[PDB]
C-alpha cells in the first residue's frame, strides 16, 4: 500500500538495519521500504538539497544532531509528536543529552538511531610488545610517543590512524574536537575566526607531523569507514574515533583483532577540555510529507527498545545500536556483552557541546559549529586541511586560507549580528 524511500549512510549499523526490515513489514503489512545508501559527505549534500528545495526524493531522512534542531526550528521537519506521546516507545528512556539535542520548543524533530562520543581504541598486543601501558586518560604527548614506538611501516603496521578525508563531518569533526583539547576555538565572541591563532597551529601541525611519521599512506582519502577497515584488518596500533566503532572492532566475524582491542578516553593536554564529541544519527520526516503516518511507524520501529532486542537476538547484545537509551545501559545482558558500554555512556555524558572550549565561544558543538553556514564552511576548511595532510600545501598556508575563506563566508552571512 505505501512504500517509503529512505536516505541513509553506509555505516555498519544501517547496513544491519537493512537486513532486518522484514520485522517492520511483518508488523506493518501495508508498508514497504526501499533505500538510498550514501557515503556521509554525499548523504549530507543530497538530503540538504532535498529538504531545502522540497524535492520529494526521500520520505525518511537520516540526519545528524547538527541538522535536527536547525531544520526543526526552520519548520523543515515534521514533529514526531506521536512518538513522543507513545507509551511503548517510551521517549523518556532516550538519553537526555541526545533527546535534548533533537528537541526544539518542546517538540522532537528527529529520533536517534544511534549515538556516540569519541575515544581511543588500541591494540593491546602491540602495546604489550612495545612495552607500553595505555593510561585510562591519556595525553596527546603520550599518544605521539606510543605511535612512534608501534609503527613498523615494513610490516604494514601504522602506529596511528586518524580521519584525513575532507568533509565538514569527516576530517573537520575529528580536527575540531582535537583542537578543543589544544585550547583552540573556531570563533571568538565577535565571530572572528581563529585559524591564525597559536592553538589551531599547534593542533594542525601536531596532527600532520603525527600522521606523516606514523600514519597510513594516502590518509587524506581515509574517512571513518576506511579507518575502521584499517583497524579491523590489523594495520593500526591506535585509532581515535567514534565510540560506535567499539562493537565493530570487537566482532570476531568482521575483525581480525577483535580479542586484542583496548579502550581509553579521548586524549587531552591538561588544559581542561578532552574534546570527546557528541554525535547522533537520527531519522526524520520532511514537513509536508504526505506519508507521515507510515514514516512515523518506521522511525518508531527503528528507534525502539524492541529494535535493540531484535538485533540482540540475531547478532548478539554487543552489536545493538548504541548510545540512545538509558534502558540499554541499565541492561545486565548488554553490560556483560559490551565491555565498552560504561566508557561509551560516560563519554556521551561528559561531552560538552554547551561549553566545548577553554575560552568562551558564541556557538555550541564540540566537533561542529552549530550554525547553518557550517556545512559549506567546514567543507571548504576540510579541503584545506586534507591538502596539508597530503603535503600539497603547508600547515601555515592551510590555516591562512581557512582564515580568509571563513572570514569571507561569515561576513557574507552577516556575522556578528
Ligand atoms: O557514526 C560514525 C560517523 O558517521 C560519525 O562519527 C560522523 O563522522 C560524524 O560527522 C561525527 O561528528
Ligand 1 binding pocket includes 162 (Cβ within 6 Å): no
Supply φ then ψ for residue 191, to 5 degrees. 65, 25
Experimental technique: X-ray
Q: Which atom of ligand 1 is nearest to the CA of 242?
A: 6
Do 135 and 264 meet the contact criterion of CB atoms below 8 Å apart?
yes
User: Which residues, other chains included, contact 259 with Cβ-Cβ below 8 Å and sequence gap of 6+?
Assistant: 252
Q: Name the residue with the closest Cα to ligand 1, atom 6.
A: 242
* Helix-helix angle 171-181:374-389, to 10 degrees: 80
Residue reference for cell 506521536: 82
User: For residue 286, what are the β-bridge partners?
Assistant: 77
- Exposure b/e, 373-383, CB count within 10 A at least 16 = b: ebbebbbbbbb
**Secondary structure (DSSP) of 54-90:** T----SEEEEETTHHHHHHHTT-B---HHHHH-TTT-
Class of domain 1-117+277-369 as given by CATH: alpha beta
Supply φ then ψ for residue 104, to 5 degrees. -130, 130
Q: Name the residue with the closest Cα to ligand 1, atom 5.
A: 242
Ligand 1 binding pocket includes 367 (Cβ within 6 Å): yes
Please give the C-alpha separations between residue 57 and each of 35, 89, 110, in angstroms, as whole numbers.
11, 27, 18
Can you tell me the distance from the alpha carbon of 185 to that of 275, in angstroms, rounded to the nearest whole number?
11
Please give the C-alpha separations between residue 21 and each of 24, 291, 311, in angstroms, as whole numbers.
5, 18, 11
Nearest-5° angle of CA 137, CA 262, CA 259? 175
The C-alpha cell at 244 is 560506535
The C-alpha cell at 2 is 505505501
Can you tell me the distance from the alpha carbon of 153 to that of 141, in angstroms, rounded to the nearest whole number?
21
Resolution as reported, in Å: 1.5
**SS3 annotation, 149-215:** HHCEHHHCEECCECCCCCCCCCHHHHHHHHHHHCCCCCECCCCCECCCCHHHHHHHHHHHHHHHHHC
Nearest-5° angle of CA 255, CA 258, CA 261? 125
Ligand 1 binding pocket includes 279 (Cβ within 6 Å): yes
Ligand 1 binding pocket includes 224 (Cβ within 6 Å): yes
The C-alpha cell at 51 is 529538504
Please give the C-alpha separations between residue 294 and each of 287, 291, 310, in angstroms, as whole numbers.
14, 6, 20
Torsional class of 234: left (φ above 0), alpha (ψ -120 to 50), beta (otherwise): left
Which sign does the torsion angle of CA 85, 90, 94, 96 carry?
A: positive
Supply φ then ψ for residue 64, to 5 degrees. -90, 170
Same fold, 1-117+277-369 and 118-276+370-417: yes
Ligand 1 binding pocket includes 67 (Cβ within 6 Å): no
Provide the residue ranges of all domains of the chain, joining segments of one domain with +.
1-117+277-369, 118-276+370-417
CATH number of the domain at 118-276+370-417, please? 3.40.190.10
Please give the C-alpha separations between residue 48 and each of 14, 77, 175, 180, 366, in angstroms, as whole numbers.
19, 12, 23, 27, 21
Residue 378 CA to ligand 1 centre (angstroms): 14
Task: Report CA 56 to chain centroid distance, whole Å.
Answer: 26
The runs of H, that is alpha helices, within 323-394 are: 326-329, 332-337, 341-350, 374-389
* Helix-helix angle 198-214:171-181, to 10 degrees: 120
Please give the C-alpha separations between residue 404 and each of 80, 209, 374, in angstroms, as whole numbers.
40, 24, 15
User: Which residues, other chains included, contact 245 with Cβ-Cβ below 8 Å and sequence gap of 6+?
Assistant: 121, 224, 228, 231, 239
Do 2 and 294 meet the contact criterion of CB atoms below 8 Å apart?
yes
Can you tell me the distance from the alpha carbon of 353 to that of 355, in angstroms, rounded to the nearest whole number?
5
The C-alpha cell at 151 is 609503527
Q: Is 116 exposed, middle or buried (0-12, 13-18, 19+ CB in 10 A)?
A: buried
User: Shortest CA distance to 248 belongs to which of 270, 227, 269?
Assistant: 227
Q: Which atom of ligand 1 is nearest to the CA of 279?
A: 12
Q: Output DSSP code: residue 52.
A: H
User: Shortest CA distance to 48 belongs to which of 77, 24, 16, 82?
Assistant: 77
Do 68 and 110 meet the contact criterion of CB atoms below 8 Å apart?
yes
Nearest-5° angle of CA 179, CA 180, CA 182? 65
Q: Are strands 60-64 and 118-123 parallel, antiparallel or unpaired?
A: unpaired
Do 244 and 323 meet the contact criterion of CB atoms below 8 Å apart?
yes
Can you tell me the distance from the alpha carbon of 33 to that of 2, in angstroms, rounded to the nearest whole number?
9
Amino acid at each position: 500500500a505505501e512504500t517509503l524511500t529512505i536516505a541513509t549512510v553506509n555505516n555498519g549499523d544501517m547496513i544491519r538495519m537493512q537486513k532486518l526490515t522484514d520485522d517492520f513489514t511483518k508488523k506493518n503489512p501495508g508498508i514497504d521500504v526501499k533505500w538510498v545508501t550514501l557515503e556521509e559527505n554525499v548523504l549530507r549534500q543530497k538530503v540538504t538539497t532535498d529538504v531545502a528545495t522540497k524535492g520529494g526524493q526521500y520520505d525518511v531522512m537520516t540526519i545528524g544532531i547538527y541538522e535536527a534542531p536547525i531544520w526543526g526550528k526552520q519548520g523543515w521537519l515534521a514533529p514526531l509528536d506521536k512518538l513522543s506521546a507513545d507509551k511503548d516507545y517510551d521517549a523518556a528512556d532516550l538519553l537526555p543529552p541526545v533527546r535534548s539535542g533533537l528537541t526544539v520548543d518542546g517538540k522532537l524533530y528527529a529520533a536517534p538511531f544511534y549515538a556516540e562520543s569519541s575515544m581511543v581504541m588500541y591494540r593491546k598486543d602491540l602495546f604489550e610488545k612495545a612495552g607500553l601501558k595505555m593510561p585510562e586518560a591519556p595525553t596527546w604527548d603520550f599518544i605521539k610517543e606510543a605511535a612512534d614506538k608501534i609503527t613498523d611501516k615494513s610490516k604494514e603496521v601504522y602506529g596511528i590512524c586518524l580521519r584525513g578525508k575532507a568533509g565538514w563531518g569527516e576530517n573537520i569533526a575529528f580536527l575540531s574536537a582535537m583542537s578543543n583539547s589544544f585550547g583552540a576555538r573556531w570563533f571568538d565572541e565577535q565571530w572572528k575566526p581563529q585559524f591564525d591563532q597559536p592553538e589551531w597551529k599547534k593542533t594542525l601541525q601536531f596532527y600532520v607531523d603525527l600522521m606523516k611519521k606514523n600514519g597510513p599512506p594516502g590518509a587524506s582519502s581515509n574517512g571513518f569507514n576506511e579507518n575502521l577497515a584499517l583497524f579491523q584488518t590489523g594495520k593500526c596500533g591506535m585509532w581515535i574515533d567514534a565510540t560506535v566503532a567499539a562493537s565493530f572492532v570487537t566482532n570476531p566475524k568482521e575483525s581480525k583483532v577483535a580479542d586484542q582491542v583496548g579502550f581509553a578516553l579521548a586524549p587531552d593536554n591538561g588544559l581542561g577540555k578532552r574534546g570527546n564529541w557528541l554525535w547522533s544519527w537520527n531519522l526524520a520526516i520532511p514537513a509536508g510529507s504526505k506519508k507521515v503516518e507510515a514514516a512515523e511507524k518506521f522511525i518508531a520501529w527503528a528507534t525502539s527498545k524492541d529494535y535493540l532486542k531484535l538485533v540482540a537476538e540475531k547478532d548478539g547484545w554487543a552489536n545493538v545500536p548504541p548510545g540512545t537509551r538509558t534502558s540499554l545501559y541499565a541492561n545486565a545482558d548488554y553490560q556483560k556483552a559490551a565491555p565498552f558500554a560504561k566508557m561509551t555512556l560516560d563519554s556521551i555524558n561528559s561531552a560538552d557541546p554547551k561549553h566545548p572550549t577553554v575560552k568562551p565561544v558564541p556557538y555550541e558543538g564540540v566537533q561542529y559549529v552549530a550554525i547553518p553556514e557550517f556545512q559549506g564552511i567546514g567543507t571548504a576548511v576540510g579541503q584545506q586541511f586534507s591538502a596539508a595532510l597530503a603535503g600539497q600545501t603547508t600547515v601555515d598556508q592551510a590555516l591562512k586560507t581557512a582564515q580568509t575563506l571563513t572570514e569571507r563566508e561569515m561576513k557574507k552571512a552577516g556575522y556578528p549580528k
